[PDB]
Amino acid sequence: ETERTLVIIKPDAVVRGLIGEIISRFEKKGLKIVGMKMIWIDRELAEKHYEEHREKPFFKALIDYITKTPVVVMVLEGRYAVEVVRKMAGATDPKDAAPGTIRGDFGLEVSDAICNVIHASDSKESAEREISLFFKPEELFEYPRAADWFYKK
Amino acid sequence: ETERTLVIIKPDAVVRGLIGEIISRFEKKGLKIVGMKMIWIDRELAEKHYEEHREKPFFKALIDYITKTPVVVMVLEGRYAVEVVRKMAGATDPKDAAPGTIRGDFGLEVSDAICNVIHASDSKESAEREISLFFKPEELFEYPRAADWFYK
Numbered sequence: 001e002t003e004r005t006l007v008i009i010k011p012d013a014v015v016r017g018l019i020g021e022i023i024s025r026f027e028k029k030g031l032k033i034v035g036m037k038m039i040w041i042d043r044e045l046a047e048k049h050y051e052e053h054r055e056k057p058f059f060k061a062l063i064d065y066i067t068k069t070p071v072v073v074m075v076l077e078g079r080y081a082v083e084v085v086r087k088m089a090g091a092t093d094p095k096d097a098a099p100g101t102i103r104g105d106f107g108l109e110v111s112d113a114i115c116n117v118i119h120a121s122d123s124k125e126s127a128e129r130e131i132s133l134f135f136k137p138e139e140l141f142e143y144p145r146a147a148d149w150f151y152k153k
Numbered sequence: 154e155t156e157r158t159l160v161i162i163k164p165d166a167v168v169r170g171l172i173g174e175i176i177s178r179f180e181k182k183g184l185k186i187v188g189m190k191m192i193w194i195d196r197e198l199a200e201k202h203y204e205e206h207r208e209k210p211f212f213k214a215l216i217d218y219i220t221k222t223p224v225v226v227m228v229l230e231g232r233y234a235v236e237v238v239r240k241m242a243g244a245t246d247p248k249d250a251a252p253g254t255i256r257g258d259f260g261l262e263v264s265d266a267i268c269n270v271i272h273a274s275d276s277k278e279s280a281e282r283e284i285s286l287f288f289k290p291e292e293l294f295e296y297p298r299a300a301d302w303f304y305k
Contacts, residue, residue: 005155010289012187014296015296015297016299017180017181017298017299018178019173019177019186020173020174020175020176020178020179020180021175021177022173023172023173023176024172024173024174024177025173026173027171027172027173029171033167033172033191034191035188035191036189036191036225037189037190037191037231037292038187038188038189038190038227038292038294039230040296069296069297070294070296072189074191079228080279080282083286085263106156117155139190139191141191141193141222141223143167143168143193143223144168144222145168145170146169146170
């Protein structure tokens with residue numbers, strides 16, 4: 001049931017100094033960070049990540065947003081991590097996100113793009129594609145978190 | 154003036170899930186993360202980092218400790234960042250660290266090595282050496298944090 005999903009702490013979150021708070025939510029949930037790095041995505045890489053939206057009118061503004069400042073890309077590993085992280089993220093537009101979720105607690109204001117604090121892979125297929133896009137195998141690790149032994153099935 | 158210093162969130166902090174808590178303390182202080190990545194330090198790199206202790210009896214334990222699991226290395230930028238981060242870290246041995254500091258609030262137990270949650274450059278000279286050891290220029294960025302404009 002263990003899966004890996006990709007999260008991007010977007011420019012709005014980095015600029016607002018929310019990197020730590022976001023990471024803590026994943027850590028306290030029990031999710032494991034197996035890869036992470038601060039990078040500054042250029043347009044070419046951004047367009048590859050959002051390739052499915054290439055033909056849509058909001059594409060340009062989305063690329064402008066994700067490349068505005070450096071971001072933190074990270075890979076989270078855990079039981080049903082893909083759907084669990086999406087749930088933790090909350091509704092796409094922060095105004096609709098429930099209190100308690102990352103977007104619900106930290107997001108609201110928007111620019112030309114719907115700034116929503118973080119990106120979370122929408123499926124296992126997308127996660128695999130996205131993780132391969134941003135990380136090299138040597139940048140992903142297998143190691144124990146403190147309580148891993150407790151769950152030895 | 155503005156300085157850059159190196160911080161390593163050590164294996165004990167990573168294993169205990171304290172990465173976010175630690176980073177938040179730097180962010181709320183006003184410090185800017187200009188570089189960061191999770192890496193698993195190899196013995197040779199660890200020995201370069203701790204080169205000053207190569208001839209000491211506690212050297213091996215230090216290497217075993219810092220390479221036990223992946224760590225998060227990051228570069229913090231800000232006014233007098235080197236001394237400020239050292240102050241935030243607290244006493245070397247967590248048992249002696251004051252409440253309110255990172256080591257004071259999160260560290261205590263030790264192994265063969267004095268596990269102390271994080272590493273913080275001890276001087277501007279050490280900071281420059283350490284930053285170059287773990288980061289390439291292309292991995293460090295210049296960008297605005299939300300309130301940067303306020304201090305103009």
